[PDB]
Amino acid sequence: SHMEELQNKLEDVVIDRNLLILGRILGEFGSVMEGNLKQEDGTSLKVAVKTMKNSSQREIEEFLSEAACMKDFSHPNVIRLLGVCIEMSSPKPMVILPFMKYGDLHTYLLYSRLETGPRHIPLQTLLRFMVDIALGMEYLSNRNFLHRDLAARNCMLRDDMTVCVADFGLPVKWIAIESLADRVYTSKSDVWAFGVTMWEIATRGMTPYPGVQNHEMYDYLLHGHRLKQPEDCLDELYEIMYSCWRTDPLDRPTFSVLRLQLERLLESLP
Ligand SMILES: CN(Cc1ccc2nccn2c1)c1nnc(-c2ccc(-c3ccccc3Cl)cc2)o1
């Protein structure tokens, strides 16, 4: 029955192409399109459709396998995979996601500094964003799933302004020191990317390490330098993000420890 569990997950993740109607292109690695998904209750749902790219057997079965694992995730701060579709060329898979009208968190932070879009984001909400990602990441690491592409651009905003982790890997300034050197990736490397993500949130969308080029990053970190404390950022919050960048990956806290520290800090605000 150990294999029968994979077959169960496999049947579940596939969506009939006829239940899907494709809309306009939102982004042009593969495309992001809007779509309509006909549900079991007879009504249509607005969805986001991600199309992907070379073998028509092994790599496709690999996509279905990976998608079957992804649809098994069930947490309010992890994007939910609604299912997958396949379309053949003259070998193009599609992944079906809930439509997020508020978009990615990175764009939202940037828009908040311009007169038109969202208004100034206060400290409590910036901390609520960090708690939400920590909760989603905590769910993932406890299931032994590595994100491998954690950044503000890969976190999505739901209609109730809840953040969910998304766009799972497969970005040099999000990569842990040991991942740049030993080409090794663990949950401590996700914790490092999370600290960088927290810094993007606190700076309201600044690119990490201003004045340091991508090809200078490994030598920069090797000499002990880390991301600087953002202006008006709490010392406690900075200590939490800094703890994510400890040279020894074993010294870095887990997501569960980080989530707790962030919740206490949030509750402590007036
Ligand atoms: C496109 N995107 C972001 C998004 C979401 C929602 C949204 N609404 C409007 C615009 N939007 C944009 C997104 N978030 N998560 C994913 C994703 C993509 C691929 C896979 C995957 C990769 C390999 C094998 C199997 C799978 Cl299922 C998993 C998750 O993509």
UniProtKB/Swiss-Prot annotation:
It is found in: Cell membrane. Residues 20-266 form the Protein kinase domain. Not expressed in normal B- and T-lymphocytes but is expressed in numerous neoplastic B- and T-cell lines. Highly expressed in testis, ovary, prostate, lung, and kidney, with lower expression in spleen, small intestine, colon, and liver. The active site is at residue 149. ATP binds at residues 26-32, 46. It is linked to Retinitis pigmentosa 38: A retinal dystrophy belonging to the group of pigmentary retinopathies. Retinitis pigmentosa is characterized by retinal pigment deposits visible on fundus examination and primary loss of rod photoreceptor cells followed by secondary loss of cone photoreceptors. Patients typically have night vision blindness and loss of midperipheral visual field. As their condition progresses, they lose their far peripheral visual field and eventually central vision as well. Interacts (upon activation) with TNK2; stimulates TNK2 autophosphorylation. Interacts (via N-terminus) with extracellular ligands LGALS3, TUB, TULP1 and GAS6. Interacts with VAV1 in a phosphotyrosine-independent manner. Interacts with TIMD4; this interaction enhances TIMD4-mediated efferocytosis. Receptor tyrosine kinase that transduces signals from the extracellular matrix into the cytoplasm by binding to several ligands including LGALS3, TUB, TULP1 or GAS6. Regulates many physiological processes including cell survival, migration, differentiation, and phagocytosis of apoptotic cells (efferocytosis). Ligand binding at the cell surface induces autophosphorylation of MERTK on its intracellular domain that provides docking sites for downstream signaling molecules. Following activation by ligand, interacts with GRB2 or PLCG2 and induces phosphorylation of MAPK1, MAPK2, FAK/PTK2 or RAC1. Belongs to the protein kinase superfamily. Tyr protein kinase family. AXL/UFO subfamily. This is Tyrosine-protein kinase Mer.
